[PDB]
Amino acid sequence: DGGIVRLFPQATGARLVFEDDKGALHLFNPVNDHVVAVPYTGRAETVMWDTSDTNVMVIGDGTALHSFLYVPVSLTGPQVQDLGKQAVPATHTPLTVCNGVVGCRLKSGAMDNVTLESHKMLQPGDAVARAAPAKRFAAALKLYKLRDAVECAKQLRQVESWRTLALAALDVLDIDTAINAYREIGDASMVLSLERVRQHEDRNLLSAHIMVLLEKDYGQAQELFLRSSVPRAALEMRMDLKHWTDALKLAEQLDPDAIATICKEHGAMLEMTGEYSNAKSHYQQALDALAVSVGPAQPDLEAACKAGIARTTLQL
Amino acid sequence: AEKWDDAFLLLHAHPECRQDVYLPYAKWLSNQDRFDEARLAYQEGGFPSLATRILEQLCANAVVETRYADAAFYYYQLAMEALKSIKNPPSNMAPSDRSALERFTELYDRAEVYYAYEVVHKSVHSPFRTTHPDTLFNASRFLLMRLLPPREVPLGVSVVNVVYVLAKQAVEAGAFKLARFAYNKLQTLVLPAAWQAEVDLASVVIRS
Amino acid sequence: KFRDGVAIMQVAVDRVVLENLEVEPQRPPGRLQLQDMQLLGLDLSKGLLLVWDGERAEVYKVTETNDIMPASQFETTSRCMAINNDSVYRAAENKVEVVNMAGTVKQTLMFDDNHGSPTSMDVARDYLAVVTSANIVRILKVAGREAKPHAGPAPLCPPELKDWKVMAMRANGNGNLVAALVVGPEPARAVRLVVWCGETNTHHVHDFTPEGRQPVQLMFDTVEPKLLVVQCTPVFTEANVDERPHGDAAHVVDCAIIFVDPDKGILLQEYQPIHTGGATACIGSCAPHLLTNKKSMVQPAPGSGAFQPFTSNVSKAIMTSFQGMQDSDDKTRRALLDFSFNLATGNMDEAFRSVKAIKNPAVWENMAHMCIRNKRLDVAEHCLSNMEHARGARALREAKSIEEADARVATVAVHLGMIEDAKKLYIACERYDLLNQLYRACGQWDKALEVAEKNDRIHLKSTHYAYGQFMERQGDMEGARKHYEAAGCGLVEVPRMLFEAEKFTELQNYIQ
């Protein structure tokens, strides 16, 4: 993107929000070599690091304390998220920041502390979010301090707040929120959706099977299976709940017997259905793609397709 | 006698009625969290099947702690089941009898994968070793080909030490075909990502 | 009665709430008073309500605003009667006096003394059904310009239930399948139903009084004439206290939703409550619901002391075995009313075979989709789940788990929000231990410990170890210890080493 104008390392340099030539700061994670451009752009005074968080990152330019939570692991990947663009006094030059509170320096030489709009909202001592901790639930669902939101939905005590934080953490791949919701009280059957998990580590086979069990998002599940240890699990869901939107996708590339399948139940959804014409066509090409299957020239399935061709020629 | 303990006196009576001596025994003790002595009640009375809750619970526990040896002896226990839960014998190679061999052979093959991985790979990672000297001697004649990843394996297993030591063992005691085969399969594996800065160069270096 | 689109009800001695269902809420509903009419029946035909008492009979003109006034009145030569929209079949003591608008006998239809006096009169909207004194009923088609007999003269009720007192007749749309209750005699007084199937001249049997109620109104469903929607208040003899609730609340008024088979008698589908806004009588049944009654009053105008005219005193009682019916199209209506005929009676031709074996070119929205209650899902899987259609998806989501027989249909029967129907057939396939241990899945994992004990003490330890690790996962340490310890094989780790490491032995694993 250009020359690195300013380098803002941590104490070890395992992550750093360096400045580009344009002036926009960019969080860098060289441990796994990931670059996330910070939503704050333009010249800053400095990137001082949160002593309470190596991922949450305050940009204090003398104008605002641009906090930036860094979320490296999700369904997609690393992301830098603004936890608040909260103003800073010009005389309060940011020396360091702790717990979302920037410890600045006075003009005569002293130490002064500058909080932000929502970090201190979730810190203890804010009795607005402690005597009435529903605001801590809300703002911890905002700043992804959701364990504060977890505890606060415990105290404000309903299932839907638990499920709200449960999905809000399932999006960022945290499940103990969902456990706290559902395994205390769930709808009907998500604990048998969790029980059907293998010892495979790619997160796309995993989530793809998870939403095969949820019987939803079968295009994304089949796509995640195409990047998985097995691609044919995509076609599996495709015969499991009778789709052709990607049964044909894996059938043209993997299995003419799956083409013969797709055309067998296409004849079927046109046999009992009627319009035995395209049912006849689909039954006939089901016989053909059974004959030209990469597997066997499967005689019993072809005979079933021929019973189909019997009835569909009969009604043709 | 209204007692499972006083059942045993003849609730272990004449074989070919051992199903009848042990299942009337087994419905005294079986359903009350004692499906562990009811395992051996089932061993002759029916087949040992209410056995896998504890077995797979600690199998998954050992998988979690990367201590893959409780699951070793538990798949060995499943092999003891499927070696004695076969009415057809395992010794001869009739298809029923060879399949009778094969069921506990595959369970003991799970046992042996967990064995080899934990025992030898964990020699530096976290020491945990159990061995069978007759099995290890036959291994010293025939062990090399068992160590492929996707063949009835818990998966997620690194076999760096295991590949190296297993190849050496296959080389040593003879079966001169397998010595040459293990020369082709000596060691090429890498220590985990905490060692990535050094075993990038020491992948072949550290374990031949 | 909901007749001719006008759900007319009589809530008082003279007040006849002749509510057309299409009356605007700002338009007045049915308001009509009778001149102290000893009403032995009323016959309304889209603006000509004739009421009769046995000494006079007035026909009431009705507007579309339900302004009901007497168009004409006439004396009765016989107490009951029935109108062919201008010419009234009277229940004459020896014949059917087809008396005109002025009560003079326009046409003559005859029933001899072997039939008896044609006392029961009804035109079944195309078929004048005439149950006589001896219930020998010949039914008269009117699809031309006047009456002409359609169903031959034959006893409405059998000799074993003619001694049982015959009250009235509910003739079907074809005017042959005539439902007719028989209450028991003076020592018995138990209501049995005799659906006189004039298709075959047989006499159906359904003793409601031991079977759940004593029905008050009989009517067939307006969409399928075999669905006899039997309005049913619980009244009994002194032997049938089973269905009724306690004491004064003994009327759990539930419709015997019944597909009467024309061969094997009355066969029942479900007990659908009328209790929809203080409703204790079913006055009709539209397609998506059942048109029951309601309290008859005048709604106050919103935000003011004025009174808006009532919309309709007719509560549309939603029908319950028909799921994915009402939000969906009318292929649903045919397909799954037919399937529910296959439910109450028991058949296979209608929802499946009659639509396969005809060469019917289309792609329907709901070939059939509640059909899983006769254990078939593929009709909701290739019609719907080829694209997962939503307006039959209620019975599709039911349908993936009322396939439950533990034949890989358990796994499909437990996918998302739908283990409960798997449990329903766990009850049905005699495995209610799986009812238990999968009702633990619905969020009962706190008392799942003791219900697991009810299942297995191995299941006890499975649930306690999972539950101990459940609050270990939440963060709790000592309660994790206890339910670990309350698990019989969770107990084999916790007292063993220090009582204090199931969190911490879990911690060293990532280090390893």
Numbering used by the authors:
A (entry chain I): 527 to 842
B (entry chain L): 790 to 997
C (entry chain G): 386 to 897
Article excerpt on this structure:
IFT-A, which contains six proteins (IFT144, 140, 139, 122, 121 and 43), sits between IFT-B and the membrane. IFT-A is made up of five structural proteins (IFT144, 140, 139, 122 and 121) and one disordered protein (IFT43). The resolution of our IFT-A reconstructions was limited to 18.6 Å, potentially making subunit placement difficult. However, the AlphaFold2 models of each of the four WD-containing IFT-A proteins showed unique combinations of angles between the two WD domains and the position of the first TPR repeat. This allowed us to unambiguously place the WD domains in our map and fit the C-terminal TPR domains into the connected continuous tubular densities. Finally, we identified a spiral density corresponding to IFT139 to complete our model. We do not locate the disordered IFT43 in our overall model. Surprisingly, IFT144-TPR and IFT140-TPR run into the neighboring repeat, where IFT140 (IFT140N) interacts with the C-terminal TPRs of IFT144 from the adjacent complex (IFT144N−1). IFT122, IFT121 and IFT139 form three pillars at the other end of IFT-A. The IFT122 and IFT121-WD domains are stacked together directly below the membrane.
We show how the conformations of both IFT-A and IFT-B are dependent on lateral interactions with neighboring repeats, suggesting that polymerization is required to cooperatively stabilize the complexes.
